[PDB]
Motif scaffolding. Structure first.
Motif, PDB file in Angstrom:
ATOM      1  N   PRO A  22       0.820  -1.218   0.000  1.00  0.00           N
ATOM      2  CA  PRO A  22       0.000   0.000   0.000  1.00  0.00           C
ATOM      3  C   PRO A  22       0.850   1.263   0.000  1.00  0.00           C
ATOM      4  O   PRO A  22       1.994   1.275   0.460  1.00  0.00           O
ATOM      5  N   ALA A  24       0.460   5.946  -0.247  1.00  0.00           N
ATOM      6  CA  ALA A  24      -0.398   7.096   0.002  1.00  0.00           C
ATOM      7  C   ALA A  24      -1.148   7.501  -1.264  1.00  0.00           C
ATOM      8  O   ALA A  24      -0.772   7.135  -2.381  1.00  0.00           O
ATOM      9  N   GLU A  25      -2.233   8.259  -1.074  1.00  0.00           N
ATOM     10  CA  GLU A  25      -3.066   8.667  -2.202  1.00  0.00           C
ATOM     11  C   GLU A  25      -2.356   9.711  -3.057  1.00  0.00           C
ATOM     12  O   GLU A  25      -2.469   9.698  -4.288  1.00  0.00           O
ATOM     13  N   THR A  26      -1.623  10.629  -2.423  1.00  0.00           N
ATOM     14  CA  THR A  26      -0.873  11.621  -3.187  1.00  0.00           C
ATOM     15  C   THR A  26       0.402  11.031  -3.777  1.00  0.00           C
ATOM     16  O   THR A  26       0.962  11.594  -4.725  1.00  0.00           O
ATOM     17  N   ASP A  27       0.870   9.903  -3.244  1.00  0.00           N
ATOM     18  CA  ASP A  27       2.125   9.304  -3.688  1.00  0.00           C
ATOM     19  C   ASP A  27       1.965   8.402  -4.902  1.00  0.00           C
ATOM     20  O   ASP A  27       2.972   7.902  -5.414  1.00  0.00           O
ATOM     21  N   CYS A  28       0.746   8.172  -5.370  1.00  0.00           N
ATOM     22  CA  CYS A  28       0.535   7.314  -6.534  1.00  0.00           C
ATOM     23  C   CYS A  28       0.058   8.129  -7.725  1.00  0.00           C
ATOM     24  O   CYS A  28      -1.024   8.745  -7.666  1.00  0.00           O
ATOM     25  N   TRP A  30      -1.590   7.071 -10.674  1.00  0.00           N
ATOM     26  CA  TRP A  30      -2.255   6.026 -11.442  1.00  0.00           C
ATOM     27  C   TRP A  30      -2.715   6.539 -12.790  1.00  0.00           C
ATOM     28  O   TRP A  30      -3.007   5.742 -13.685  1.00  0.00           O
ATOM     29  N   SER A  31      -2.779   7.865 -12.936  1.00  0.00           N
ATOM     30  CA  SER A  31      -3.246   8.519 -14.142  1.00  0.00           C
ATOM     31  C   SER A  31      -2.257   8.422 -15.291  1.00  0.00           C
ATOM     32  O   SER A  31      -2.635   8.719 -16.429  1.00  0.00           O
TER      33      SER A  31
END
Length: 73
Positions: A22, A24-28, A30-31
RNA sequence: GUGAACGGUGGAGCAACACCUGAAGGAAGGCUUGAUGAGCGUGUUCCCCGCAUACGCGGGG
């Protein structure tokens, strides 16, 4: 999975291992991905550009290629 | 349904030809197998060392 990439019939690129953790949300990002032409602009970076490209499924199927915003390897 | 799926770097080709490791150069100058060890003198109680522990044993000249 045991191999990744193309030309798997001639034994190229078998996977030695993988780790899935897993983050962090800001660390990925995906776009960084073949996005649709009407994708929402927080996911469309400067690397993304318009192309005849598949956004889904069989990415080789040129019949399913659409107006797409995709980055480059 | 990994822009995937499919795809022989292949076939052939002499490292080979010729070429003296060879010319010269003293194992010598000096040195007894001869000896050496083979036979030739003392004529009776005198010092000193140990075991003992003195009844005596061994022993230096």
């Amino acid at each position: 999975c045991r191999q990744i990439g193309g030309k798997r019939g001639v034994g190229f690129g078998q996977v030695a291992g993988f780790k899935v953790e897993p983050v962090a949300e800001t660390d990925c990002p995906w776009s960084w991905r073949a996005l649709p032409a009407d994708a929402d602009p927080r996911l469309v970076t400067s690397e993304h550009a318009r192309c005849i490209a598949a956004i889904r499924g069989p990415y080789w199927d040129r019949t399913l290629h659409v107006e797409a915003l995709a980055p480059t390897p």
